[PDB]
Structures are given as C-alpha cells and as structure tokens.
Amino acid sequence: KAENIVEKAINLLSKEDQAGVHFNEISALTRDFCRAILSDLEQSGFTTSELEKEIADKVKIMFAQGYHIEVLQLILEKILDSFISVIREQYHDLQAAASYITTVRDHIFKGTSFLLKMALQTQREVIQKQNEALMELST
Amino acid sequence: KAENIVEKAINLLSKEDQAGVHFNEISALTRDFCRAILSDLEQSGFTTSELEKEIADKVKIMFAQGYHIEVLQLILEKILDSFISVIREQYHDLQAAASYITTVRDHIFKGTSFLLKMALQTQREVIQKQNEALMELST
C-alpha cells in the first residue's frame, strides 16, 4: 500500500518526458497527489475534496513556475496505472480488485476533469488580465 | 446503435449547464463527437485519430466563438454515459458489454487527455501572442 503506489508511479514517470520540470519536483507532486487521493479514498461517502485541493494548488504553482500544466495530467494518469498494477498484485480476489479499481478510476477521471476546469480558468484569467492591460493601455 | 447514442447524450446534456452555447450547437457537437468516436471504434488496431481531429477542430471553433472550452469535456463525459446506458440495454451478455464499455471508456479518457493538451496549447499560444504584443510594444 501507500508508498508502494508512489514509488511505482514515480518509476513510470521516470520513463516519461518531464516537460522541463526537475525530477525531484515530479516526485514530490506524485507524492502529494497519491497522499490526497488516498485521503479521499479511505473516506466514506465519496469525497473528491482533497485531491481537488492539491490540484488547484499545484495548478497555481505550475503556472507561477512557468511549466506546462499538462504535466499534472500525466502524473495523474501514471498514478492511476500504479494503483491498477498494485491492486493486481495485492488482491487475488478479482471481484474486490475490480471494485477498488473502478472507484479509483472514478476518482482519477473526476480529478482530471477538475484539472481541466482549473487550468482553463487560470489561463483565462491571465488572458483577460493581459487583455485589459492591452485596451485600457491603448489610450 | 448510432443515433440512439446521440439522442441519449443530447438528452443528458439537456439537463446540464450549456455555458452560454446555443443548444443546437451543443447537439451538433455531440453528433460530430459520437460520429468520430464510432468511426474510431469500428476500426481495427485502436485508432484515436478521428476523435482527435474533431477535438482539435472544435477547440479552435470554441475559442474563436468565445465559449468556455470545458463545455467539450462535459459533452465527452455525457457521451460516455450514453454509451454505457445503451450498452447496458442492447448487450445482455455481461462479458461482451464489459469489454465494449472498457474500450469506449479507454477511447474517451484518451480523448479528454488530448482535449486538455489542445486547450492548453491554444490558450498558451494566445497568452504568448498578447505577451510579445505587450513587450515589443512597450518600446
């Protein structure tokens, strides 16, 4: 459990284009995300809130640091894979495994949806900023 | 099959916030997307190309028309639901149904990933345009 996901996710990400982002930051992000989605999962009543928090925050950070935000999507994707992999190992009951994997896939897909919204909102805010700058400054 | 998905998707979308977009356009988009993903599905060797085409094009259109691009994600999501619904009806063999639904879910998730990339690329291009405008014009 736990880190066994993280080190797996990280491993997959080791094989992927990092979009300029330093690998230690990549790893940290992976850890924050896994931590968040696990906090959400252990919950009763299906909470998406923690992962959402991490995502919003990290969108902010990413944009401030000037890195392509898509790199988060990738991370999520790999995390998903990681879970699947681990759950294929640890759970020999195919029904239980199927259910856990289904709920994880749910959480993740909703997470990437939220991620899309956030990234777009942010970039729009900036585009507007620059727009007002442009016009009210063409005086 | 076919339109039975579309009218279902549209129906779901009838219940959702359209983000300012006229409903006839919503419907058209739903149709283009269903058509594309079906063209991809009937293929052998797992092609994502057609849906990708539709997505890129529609990102362009959406941005030019000044509508929030997230509205495409929603459409995709509902389309997914539609398939599931239909496949729960038409296929009484749970194995076959499970497999078809799994491959559709694959196609769609990859589609939303691509959508994220595209939307971000576009908005970035604009942000940069405005940026050069800003600086080379602060002369």
Side-chain angles (χ1 to χ4, degrees):
Chain A
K1 299 293 300 164
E3 231 68 28
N4 215 290
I5 315 284
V6 181
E7 81 173 352
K8 176 52 181 172
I10 286 182
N11 183 251
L12 295 177
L13 289 155
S14 162
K15 281 84 174 284
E16 305 290 337
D17 194 79
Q18 297 154 35
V21 187
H22 294 170
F23 196 81
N24 63 310
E25 183 174 355
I26 296 288
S27 306
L29 299 169
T30 299
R31 238 170 229 115
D32 298 331
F33 279 0
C34 293
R35 189 179 72 233
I37 189 181
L38 289 173
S39 169
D40 281 340
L41 279 171
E42 73 202 8
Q43 281 274 347
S44 55
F46 187 87
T47 43
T48 36
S49 72
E50 199 64 21
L51 184 53
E52 273 158 23
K53 188 194 296 184
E54 282 307 300
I55 293 181
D57 187 47
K58 269 49 180 177
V59 171
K60 294 164 187 147
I61 299 176
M62 222 67 199
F63 192 74
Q65 296 183 347
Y67 292 121
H68 289 143
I69 294 185
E70 308 107 86
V71 80
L72 300 178
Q73 165 83 210
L74 178 64
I75 295 175
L76 285 177
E77 286 169 11
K78 294 320 186 194
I79 284 173
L80 176 48
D81 287 337
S82 185
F83 264 95
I84 292 176
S85 176
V86 170
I87 298 172
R88 294 282 243 143
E89 293 176 351
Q90 181 175 330
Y91 294 77
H92 294 53
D93 176 20
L94 301 175
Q95 189 176 351
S99 40
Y100 200 38
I101 286 184
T102 281
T103 186
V104 156
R105 194 188 272 118
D106 195 21
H107 267 89
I108 294 287
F109 185 64
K110 297 198 183 319
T112 66
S113 188
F114 185 82
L115 169 54
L116 188 109
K117 281 179 192 59
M118 287 300 112
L120 293 199
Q121 252 185 39
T122 283
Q123 288 196 325
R124 257 200 309 279
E125 284 171 357
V126 165
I127 279 171
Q128 159 60 353
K129 234 152 63 183
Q130 300 193 326
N131 263 330
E132 289 168 344
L134 235 27
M135 65 188 207
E136 278 139 346
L137 280 232
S138 287
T139 42
Chain B
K1 299 293 300 164
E3 231 68 28
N4 215 290
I5 315 284
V6 181
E7 81 173 352
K8 176 52 181 172
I10 286 182
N11 183 251
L12 295 177
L13 289 155
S14 162
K15 281 84 174 284
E16 305 290 337
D17 194 79
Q18 297 154 35
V21 187
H22 294 170
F23 196 81
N24 63 310
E25 183 174 355
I26 296 288
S27 306
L29 299 169
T30 299
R31 238 170 229 115
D32 298 331
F33 279 0
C34 293
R35 189 179 72 233
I37 189 181
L38 289 173
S39 169
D40 281 340
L41 279 171
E42 73 202 8
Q43 281 274 347
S44 55
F46 187 87
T47 43
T48 36
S49 72
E50 199 64 21
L51 184 53
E52 273 158 23
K53 188 194 296 184
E54 282 307 300
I55 293 181
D57 187 47
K58 269 49 180 177
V59 171
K60 294 164 187 147
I61 299 176
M62 222 67 199
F63 192 74
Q65 296 183 347
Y67 292 121
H68 289 143
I69 294 185
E70 308 107 86
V71 80
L72 300 178
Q73 165 83 210
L74 178 64
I75 295 175
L76 285 177
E77 286 169 11
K78 294 320 186 194
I79 284 173
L80 176 48
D81 287 337
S82 185
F83 264 95
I84 292 176
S85 176
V86 170
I87 298 172
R88 294 282 243 143
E89 293 176 351
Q90 181 175 330
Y91 294 77
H92 294 53
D93 176 20
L94 301 175
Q95 189 176 351
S99 40
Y100 200 38
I101 286 184
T102 281
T103 186
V104 156
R105 194 188 272 118
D106 195 21
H107 267 89
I108 294 287
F109 185 64
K110 297 198 183 319
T112 66
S113 188
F114 185 82
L115 169 54
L116 188 109
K117 281 179 192 59
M118 287 300 112
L120 293 199
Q121 252 185 39
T122 283
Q123 288 196 325
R124 257 200 309 279
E125 284 171 357
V126 165
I127 279 171
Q128 159 60 353
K129 234 152 63 183
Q130 300 193 326
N131 263 330
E132 289 168 344
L134 235 27
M135 65 188 207
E136 278 139 346
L137 280 232
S138 287
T139 42

